[PDB]
Design a protein around this ligand. Structure first.
Ligand SMILES: CC(=O)Nc1nnc(S(N)(=O)=O)s1
Ligand SMILES: CC(=O)Nc1nnc(S(N)(=O)=O)s1
Ligand SMILES: CC(=O)Nc1nnc(S(N)(=O)=O)s1
Ligand SMILES: CC(=O)Nc1nnc(S(N)(=O)=O)s1
Ligand SMILES: [Cl-]
Ligand SMILES: [Cl-]
Ligand SMILES: [Zn+2]
Ligand SMILES: [Zn+2]
Ligand SMILES: [Zn+2]
Ligand SMILES: [Zn+2]
Lengths: 222, 222, 222, 222
């Protein structure tokens, strides 16, 4: 059966207990939100940002897609970025990858001829991979996987920092930080991969790739 | 200001307590997932699917985006759908809108010349709206907003049922149900807007738009 | 063989004759362009806009895709629109469909479960189709095809007029017209389907769908 | 100002003369096409493929977009590619850049905070640029611009060869060649930047990026 009764019952029991412990738990967000965080993470069923950070409704705005990817040409992720940064004025963007991420493994192993949309989607993972032969080759299957996850976080942090939305927000002096983090489904713990990046100065210090030259390329020419 | 230790500490507290309540809580999903559900919902910070359904990790795979939109030409939501239906073999897709959704309100009130990627992204909403313009005619602002949310949930349920991925899964006799639900941020409760749709028969019964005609349109030419 | 010699030879012979008849034919566009037209048409090999209009280099900027489709969420077509309208200040946008357009036929006949990217792409054609059962049903295969082509032109003209780019240009008083036209591969002739639309006043007169209500929807509510 | 009769009349003049020179010119492509080529080139008004190769209708299927970009996650250029390779069985794909391409120049000079969809769309160009930053270092503006155009043609040739569609066609032994060419708007001439690539062997010989490593990367893990 496809009956939803038991699901709905679990929700009702949850909202009942929540509101019993704190009468304004839901009511205070009945007509507005003011989260301080955007989280961009993987769609993987093991990785729920509000649960894992013990956040209540109204604290974290969420984009989740296969592989936690950020591209300037993806209107879905870019709309979550633009709405949160420009209208909600969130303060912090958490870019979260996770170990055991099948999208990262498929990015390592699949032949690109593979049919379907997921294989198109994870092209970004191949691009990150391809720039890192030297860190990936010769590693055990497992270690290569872990490394791919990590490299993917770093690249997606760079993409968030280089995004027109973040770049415009920094240029107008809006406070905005970007965090590279990674989660372990099998332990429920988050680790910090990259320390906070609050602007171009921190990005030059903390990112391998050169954000400054990316933004001001013309200054590297004759 | 931007330091993460407080968040990390909340995450550690949380993981210890879950491990203390059940020591296989995380470890049993360390290397695989077998969720039964895919949830497609809004990125709004007040709506966290695993939390609101009181699910543990490994139970609901998640796509969240501004206004809970589903289009065959978004590779972001389409890859969540492909991976879950084709590879994980989920059984149920929950398509969840929410009252007080500002993407629905913007789809009613914004002029389309408005700059930025969010206005591009909510084009889908304007189309749902335009197709149902007579239903929205003359309603108070609040009523029109609530009706916009509901019409959009019905439209995204139709889009999920009409998708190549779901249509192909049904053609091969894979059991797969689609659910139109709505959440009220001010109460924490889910309501079922549309009963379970398990196939074409259900869709003919339950949807205002004609899925059979969409799938077999050319049978009505001379 | 994949040798390009004969192709290159045909090009050299062409550029030689062109420049022999008119010494500045190429040189005057060696370092800038100032076209007055954007053309959005089908990628079909039988339909070449500069040939069919007898235009020389520098007169018509071109987007061509399968089915001549225009969506606010397609960065490829939207970049051609934005660059031409905002930077080149073109004056006229030709939206050209063509009879015998296999994309329009596939939009009529394909089952949506059909695999691959083209089937995703032509979802727009289904949406136009779906809004027109009354004009399509009961027609011969051939007449339905022709009608689909025509309806698709009209819808894509509306999409160009409703685009944020065109809407912004009209709001600042930039002169910009939009033309619905159709080509017959088997005769080489263009026909005018919709007369010129130079702004909101003409669009209310010449488009079936209501552009004004689309742009100012809020004014239809209580 | 916006009336089309002059354009329509040029079109009639042109069609009569072609029919007068050869009375089966149009009629022989009235109901089908069998082009041998797919051309992917820039939307720039100075570059019209059928004209510059002196082709009649039915010879070259065309995708044109700002900066002649090819990405697996653009359904617009991917559907041109799928339809031609899989259904029309074209033999040759021409990937054509052009000197004096302002999309290449913007990819060197724009800051990424720049508003609008064109800046999103040329992100691909910035990535080609960033990967080849040492080649562009210290060149005069003109030299860097010409080198940008060339590096982008090579990158889009690689992207075409790496695409699922071409890779699958080669895996099935379909003959299909890919060509890197460049056009000079000021002279009307095409130059061949990269010799014909007919398969993996050719690609290994001719491309600066390693297509074999992209396709079989995981063979180099432990
Ligand atoms: C083909 C493919 O993407 N495989 C995946 N496996 N696990 C995934 S996860 N972490 O995104 O849920 S995606
Ligand atoms: C322009 C716009 O989209 N406004 C939004 N307001 N709330 C949104 S929500 N519910 O997606 O967080 S989107
Ligand atoms: C599946 C599909 O799209 N079929 C096509 N047939 N002809 C086309 S055309 N006019 O775009 O070249 S596309
Ligand atoms: C910002 C930008 O893209 N500028 C352009 N200039 N010329 C272009 S062309 N060769 O695509 O017509 S694009
Ligand atoms: Cl979530
Ligand atoms: Cl063309
Ligand atoms: Zn994952
Ligand atoms: Zn919402
Ligand atoms: Zn066509
Ligand atoms: Zn160009």
């Amino acid at each position: 059966t496809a009956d939803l009764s038991p699901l709905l019952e679990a929700n009702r029991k949850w909202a009942d207990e929540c509101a019993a412990k704190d009468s304004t738990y839901f009511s205070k967000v009945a007509g507005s939100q003011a989260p301080e965080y955007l989280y961009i993470g993987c769609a993987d069923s093991r990785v729920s940002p509000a649960q894992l950070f013990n956040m209540a409704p109204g604290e974290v705005f969420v984009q989740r897609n296969v592989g936690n990817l950020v591209s300037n040409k993806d209107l879905n992720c870019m709309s979550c970025l633009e709405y949160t940064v420009d209208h909600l004025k969130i303060k912090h963007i958490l870019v979260c990858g996770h170990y055991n991420c099948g999208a990262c493994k498929a990015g390592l192993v699949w032949h690109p001829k593979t049919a379907g949309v997921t294989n198109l989607w994870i092209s970004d993972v191949r691009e990150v991979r391809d720039k890192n032969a030297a860190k990936l080759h010769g590693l055990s299957a497992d270690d290569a996987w872990d490394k791919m996850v990590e490299l993917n976080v770093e690249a997606q942090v760079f993409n968030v920092c280089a995004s027109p939305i973040v770049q415009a927000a920094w240029a107008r002096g809006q406070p905005l930080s970007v965090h590279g983090i990674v989660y372990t489904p099998g332990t429920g713990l988050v680790k910090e991969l990259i320390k906070p990046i609050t602007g171009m100065e921190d990005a030059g210090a903390l990112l391998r790739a050169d954000l400054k030259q990316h933004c001001f390329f013309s200054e590297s020419l004759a």
